[PDB]
Structure formats: C-alpha cells, structure tokens
C-alpha cells in the first residue's frame, strides 16, 4: 500500500491560535493510490477456501 501523491503543508488559522492543516500541492504526474497484490499467491490461498 503506497500513495504516489506527493503533498506539501498548508496551514490556515481559524480565529485565534487554532491552526488548520490541509493538502498543499501535488508534485509530479496525476496517479491513483496503488495498493498492489500477488496474483498466484492469492489464487493459492483461494484454492483451499473454495475446497472448504
């Protein structure tokens, strides 16, 4: 589980003292989070699931 969305730090103060931190700017190309998993390993785990 990765997230190649590279974000900076933007702080805007709401009234006295209080600080709100939100997503700054994304550096690079636009892309999905990208979790990733194996194909065969899972298949192998599913093998005994369908059998049970």
């Amino acid at each position: 589980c990765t997230r190649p969305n590279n974000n900076t730090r933007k702080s805007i103060h709401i009234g006295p003292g209080r600080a709100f931190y939100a997503t700054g700017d994304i550096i690079g190309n636009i892309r999905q989070a990208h979790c990733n998993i194996s194909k065969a390993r899972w298949n192998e785990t599913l093998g005994q699931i369908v059998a049970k």
């Epitope: 190649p4 690079g28 190309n29 892309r31 999905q32 990208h34």
Partner: antibody, heavy 129, light 101 residues
C-alpha cells in the same frame, strides 16, 4: 531507429497482400507500440492498426473485415494482411513506431501517446493487375 | 472523417495559423506530423504534459503556430486523434501549405 520494408508491391484486383517491415535497431523494443500508414497517391493519409506485444487488437474499424496484423515474438519484424479490399486507394504504405513513455508501470494508470516518432523507408504498393 | 483545412498561404516572416476541427479534441489531444514531397514523414509534436512549434488545448479547433518562419517549411500536414474507445484516428482531405517568394 532503422526500418526496412519488404513484400511484393503488386496485387491482382481483390486477392491478398503480404506486406512486411523489419525493425533493425532499438534500445527498448517491447514497451513501444507499432502502427501502419496508408498514404494516398497524392491526396491525404489513412490510419491502420496499432499492435502491441501483449496481444493488443486496437485497429482501424472502418475496414475491420480487412485487418489482420502480425506480430512476431522472436525478432522485431512485422507483417500485414490485406483481405478482399486492396483496389480502392492505391499509392504508398509507410510503417511507424508509436511511442508510449509511461511515467508509472501501471498499464491503465499513466499511459499516453507521443505519436509516430520513428518512420521507415516506405514501399510502393500499386494495384492494376 | 476529419475537418482538415485544405490550403493556407504563409505570412511574410510573421504569424502562422492552422485549425483542424473535430468532435474529440478535449479527448486525445492533437498530434500533427508532416509529409515531405516524395519523402518519409517526420516529428512535429513534443507531447508530455498529462519542439519550437506549440498549440493550445481547445475544444473548438486546438490550432498550431509554426513561428515567424517564411521559407524552409512547406509540406503536406495531417492530424491523428484517438476516439474515447481507441477506435480510429481520422484524417481529412490533407493540408497543402504554400510559401511566398
């Protein structure tokens, strides 16, 4: 980088065409795609195919019952089969590489076209019996 | 298939303008390329944002400017734009430019 075209440039009305093109040199010969171009005698241009090693069947649908694109695994030589329609527009046929340049290896994520960057010599295919 | 401009003359070392209209445009960018008389076509576009000559990504015509170059540039121009389902690229009735002098 280099492209050498082969095959007989003569076809009898209708019949079949066994057009060929060999890729001579490349640093990255798999990730990049492949396209065929139909140049009019002296008018315009027409798009053919688009073939990739993964078994991609992206092609010209205007002449869908005429398209048969060949991709050889060993060596980067490509072949094209023209069935039934050959005599309608006859002139020149060029072969060009369609660059991909993926930022991320995700096939659905960051794929784009740079266009037909590398073109070949181009052989003359004239149909008149 | 495509609404390609037939023929436009050159300005005397000034502003250059072309169109090429169609339905995709905002879908699969532009891509130009030029056919040299009796020679193999060559590169024009330098697409990377997901040389020399540039264009504006519009939904009307897109257009393209080749700077203030009068001579050294005269060939048959085209446009290759992919459909939403990667169907075809579509091309018009060619673009045969002419140089003055």
């Amino acid at each position: 980088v280099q492209l050498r075209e082969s095959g007989p440039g003569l076809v009898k009305p209708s019949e079949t065409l066994s057009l060929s093109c060999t890729v001579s040199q490349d640093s990255r010969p798999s990730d990049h795609s492949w396209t065929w171009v139909r140049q009019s005698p002296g008018k315009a241009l027409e798009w053919i195919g688009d073939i990739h090693y993964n078994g991609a069947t992206t092609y010209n649908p205007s002449l869908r019952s005429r398209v048969r694109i060949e991709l050889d695994q060993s060596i980067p030589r490509f072949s094209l089969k023209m069935t039934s329609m050959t005599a309608a527009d006859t002139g020149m046929y060029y072969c060009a590489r369609n660059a991909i340049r993926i930022y991320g290896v995700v096939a659905l994520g960051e794929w784009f076209h740079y266009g037909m960057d590398v073109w070949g010599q181009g052989t003359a295919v004239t149909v008149s019996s | 298939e495509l609404t390609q401009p037939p023929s436009v003359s050159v300005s005397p070392g000034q502003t250059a303008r072309i169109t090429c209209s169609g339905a995709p445009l905002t879908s699969r960018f532009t891509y130009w390329y030029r056919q040299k008389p009796g020679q193999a076509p060559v590169l024009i576009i330098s697409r990377s944002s997901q040389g020399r000559f540039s264009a504006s990504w519009s939904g009307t015509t897109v257009t393209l400017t080749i700077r203030g170059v009068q001579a050294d540039d005269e060939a048959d121009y085209y446009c290759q734009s992919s459909d939403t389902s990667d169907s075809y690229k579509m091309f018009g009735g060619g673009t045969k430019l002419t140089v003055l002098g």
